[PDB]
Amino acid sequence: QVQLQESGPGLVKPSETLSLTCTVSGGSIGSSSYYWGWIRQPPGKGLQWIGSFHYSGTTYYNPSLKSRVTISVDTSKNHFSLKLSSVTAADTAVYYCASRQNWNDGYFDYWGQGTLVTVSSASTKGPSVFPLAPSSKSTSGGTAALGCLVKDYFPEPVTVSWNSGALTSGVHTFPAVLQSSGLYSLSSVVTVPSSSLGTQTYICNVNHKPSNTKVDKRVEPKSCDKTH
């Protein structure tokens, strides 16, 4: 009945101000007597409350975070906004704007689509591919795992396929995990029998629109097994 839309830059650095906006459709900012509010959820963690705006003009914030956070509203284009002065890298999280239609209390009943905001790294670095080739020393009597790792790229996600996406059965991917250097790594692997290596050549296709980078990597049996 009321829809909330979130908007923000997504990518910043330490020490500037994080600006977020939640707009309201199907209603008004000056709607019935109830709260508006913002909370956050760090990736892979629980939800954390930022603050709430009461319809009478009173505002509430988390006491340990109010020193840098501020909530504002505007009726003219009908939204409310969150500002966090001097954001740090630790604030990377999926942020949600929420509401409580029925009654008036600290609970929240209406929600938008919270957006992930990151504070580290740069958007211009394109991925490189780390081949994961099986070997006879790695084969346990007919079981082999091949794959490709997407490393040194930002921002995630990056689309990874095998033979232009023709190979999807047996393909397994993992959620990307941020490294201390600010880069992500994503593994796409296939579990096969050892005999399939000599019949099909595997091509890992890594495509990244934000960096405009297309990489095709050829997976081959390990070259270290030759008699050099």
């Binding site: 629980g46 939800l47 409350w49 509430y60 988390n62 006491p63 949600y96 929420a98 029925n102 209390d105 600290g106 609970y107 929240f108 009943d109 929600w111 938008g112 689509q113 919270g114 780390f130 081949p131 994961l132 346990s140 795992a145 993992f174 959620p175 995990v177 270290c224």
Partner: protein, 212 residues
């Protein structure tokens, strides 16, 4: 401030069978407690407020009870969208609003040993002055497993990262990834590197190693 906790941290009950979660408060809150349900990738949904009250659009499966410092949430039967993360919120005294750490509902699957295998570092990372060792545990239940890194029979810890995937939609198991990053000199000086896993499906802790 007011603090409160939940119990158990992770709960494992098969679908269609009655389930119970506890929440305990450090101080009296009368009946000012609420239960929220959250699915991964989705905004949390309020389930119970003030206890014994069902919010709008909610079936009769969930039932809250309790008072004072102790509250209980009982689901008569578990259908397979009931598996999510459950939180308790208090209005006995706020602000601050205090939430629980959250509880996870599992499916009581048969316990199975992981397939533990090691990817040693390859030359592409070794040429960069570092090394990354991968320890994969495939198709195991329950998700809980203890992963250690052993080097030359000397334990390495605190410099590796772990990840647990979502419960598989096919057979309701879990897969775990352990990544150990070491420097080039430390990698050269040491010869054997091993991942040691203790799991309920394993009769003994299993060590899988590779020699430099």
């Amino acid at each position: 401030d007011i603090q409160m906790t939940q119990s158990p941290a992770t709960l494992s009950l098969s679908p269609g069978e009655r389930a119970t979660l506890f929440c305990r408060a450090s101080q009296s809150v009368s009946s000012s407690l609420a239960w929220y349900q959250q699915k991964p990738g989705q905004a949390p949904r309020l389930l119970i407020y003030d206890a014994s009250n069902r919010a709008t659009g909610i079936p009769a499966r969930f039932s809250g009870s309790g008072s004072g410092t102790d509250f209980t949430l009982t689901i008569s039967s578990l259908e397979p969208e009931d598996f999510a993360v459950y939180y308790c919120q208090q209005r006995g005294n706020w602000p601050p609003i205090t939430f629980g750490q959250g509880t996870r509902l599992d499916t009581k699957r048969t316990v199975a040993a992981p397939s533990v295998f090691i990817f040693p570092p390859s030359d592409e990372q070794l040429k960069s002055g570092t090394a990354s060792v991968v320890c994969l545990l495939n198709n195991f239940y329950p998700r809980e497993a203890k992963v250690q890194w052993k080097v030359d029979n000397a334990l390495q810890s605190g410099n590796s990262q772990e990840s647990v995937t979502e419960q598989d939609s096919k057979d309701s198991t879990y897969s775990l990834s352990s990544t150990l990053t070491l420097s080039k000199a430390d990698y050269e000086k040491h010869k054997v590197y091993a991942c040691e896993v203790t799991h309920q499906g394993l009769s003994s802790p299993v060590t899988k190693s590779f020699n430099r």
